[PDB]
Structure 1
């Protein structure tokens, strides 16, 4: 059984919070359809414990859930169950990915990012248009799949968090990771980042390392048509500084690393790992790719490029690197 214990009190509050909210929604009717009031809605909870549960939890904290009805529906349109989502985020504490802190849920299905009050304001202004977009494309997008948005407050420390579906497989390990923008300018990983176990390589590192993505002509078309649809929507919203995260799973490298210690190697459930693409039969090395648009909440309002320029330069860059 769960006690939501952590060295980090913010994670304890986050774990209690997701548990609380998912339970609260089991006592709230599924609406026929979402209404405009849901898109400016929230739930606030202030807990003050005195000489009670001092060992497992902080005694004084707050937890705010933004637009609870919209996010329960977004979760459902992405094929996630509320009980599964709850267990993934509470059965065991989320791990840090070593400012803009990133945490992965213990089962590697969800990602938790610490965001600013501006991102939360931007999230609210794009929420109606974002929800309708997810409706019109039947949840089939390269865009981030936002599943919850919370405000945490413990020990006089206030943080905002957004939960997304991982880009990378919950099961298959990623040996190479790229953050791609293109256009402007000397985007390259530093010698310091290059020293990490899994560095975040960038645009020039993709070209200079001689990186190729061996997907068949059909998948390449299906992907680039999906990318244009999503990147066109992004420019309408006046968003920018977004990138395409690329993760590569190396099958025969994953096999040798597991020989040291009903799915075959190089196989994944696309109902779980939604961003996965198999390599084609003529690939020099059996790999699996995981690609999606990441980091979308930077508005134009707050020499330089505009969102139309940003969108074309980006699509051109991905289409040329395939």
Structure 2
């Protein structure tokens, strides 16, 4: 009963079925980065229960995104199911998550789409270079939906948080000089999103061991410098904490599905798993400063 949502599900379904007939090459050509597929549907006096009568659906660079999915260890059939088997769920009073909590579906602006197009080749090559091991967003699909006059753009990414294990505390850190704090309107929703100073206040610590910390920051440095290089800024580190005590394995996670998980070290006051990655990178006081400033912060909290 959300028409835009059902066009998306329809669109992803259509998209993955078409690609299932297209031979997967090992390389992308420069044209794959300029490519798209467009489908206009006009149903007259037919199929009213499921679909709108008039909708358009556009996928950007379908070959590039399939290549990315593969590189992030995502199988097209699973991706299709996660997005289609049952409707994605809305998240605030905004974004959606797939019914299985695996994927995030964010509405973005035509500006954001333009920027994504702009960085896609370099983004792809970066993913190739690091063999998919990164704390960058994992962009999996990018679409344009049209439902009789309304036009929206969506991007699909991997969830930073676990699909199984809940997260009682969420942070969003930038390490900025200006003060960042959470709304009391937000604090009163079951799961709030705290910011820099909610953290830098109530004594929040991340208990990971020195190897795990080394790996993470090495990754973060490479990622962040690549973002700097692209003149990108205003991105956050999304930090989620799962308290094992409150909520198969009786506390362990699948490291091949919940890629951003790190177990706490043995002397950790409480049994905790952490989920950390970069989010929200498509905004284009300066990029080169922001990067090292962001890195300073994350170092001092870990």
Matching residue within 5, 13, 18 for 1:11:
5
CA RMSD of superposed structures (Å) = 1.0
Count of aligned positions: 301
1:33 aligns with 2:48: no
Query: How far did 1:29 drift?
Result: 1.5
Query: How far did 1:193 drift?
Result: 1.2
Query: How far did 1:185 drift?
Result: 1.2
Secondary structure in structure 2 of the residue aligned to 1:200 = coil
CA contact (8 A) 1:266 1:278 kept: no
Distance 2:263 2:244 in 1: 11
Distance 2:294 2:31 in 1: 35
Listed one character per residue, the Cα deviations across residues 191-225 of structure 1 (whole Å, up to 9, x for unaligned) are 11111111110001001111000000100110011
Distance 1:155 1:175 in 2: 40
Deviating more after overlay: 191-200 vs 87-96: 191-200
Matching residue within 146, 156, 176 for 1:153:
146
Query: How far did 1:106 drift?
Result: 0.2
Distance 1:16 1:210 in 2: 46
Query: How far did 1:314 drift?
Result: 0.3
Query: How far did 1:20 drift?
Result: 0.1
Query: How far did 1:266 drift?
Result: 2.0
So what's the TM-score if we normalise by structure 2?
0.98
Listed one character per residue, the Cα deviations across residues 218-271 of structure 1 (whole Å, up to 9, x for unaligned) are 0011001100000000000000000000000001111xxxxxxxx322200110
2:295 aligns with: 315
Listed one character per residue, the Cα deviations across residues 156-210 of structure 1 (whole Å, up to 9, x for unaligned) are 1100000000000000001000000012211000211111111110001001111
Distance 1:183 1:123 in 2: 24
Distance 1:184 1:193 in 2: 22
Secondary structure in structure 2 of the residue aligned to 1:239 = coil
Listed one character per residue, the Cα deviations across residues 60-99 of structure 1 (whole Å, up to 9, x for unaligned) are 100000000000000000000010000000000000012x
Moved over 3 A (4+): none
Query: How far did 1:51 drift?
Result: 1.4
Distance 2:45 2:81 in 1: 28
Listed one character per residue, the Cα deviations across residues 296-321 of structure 1 (whole Å, up to 9, x for unaligned) are 0011xxxxx11110001100000001
Listed one character per residue, the Cα deviations across residues 14-61 of structure 1 (whole Å, up to 9, x for unaligned) are 000000000011121112310111101100100000111101111110
So what's the TM-score if we normalise by structure 1?
0.92
Distance 2:192 2:83 in 1: 26
Deviating more after overlay: 288-297 vs 178-187: 178-187
Distance 1:86 1:209 in 2: 42
Secondary structure in structure 2 of the residue aligned to 1:298 = coil
Distance 2:177 2:9 in 1: 40
Listed one character per residue, the Cα deviations across residues 263-299 of structure 1 (whole Å, up to 9, x for unaligned) are 3222001100000000111011101000000000011
1:56 aligns with: 50
Structure 1 stretches of 5 or more lacking a match?
Answer: 1-7, 255-262, 300-304
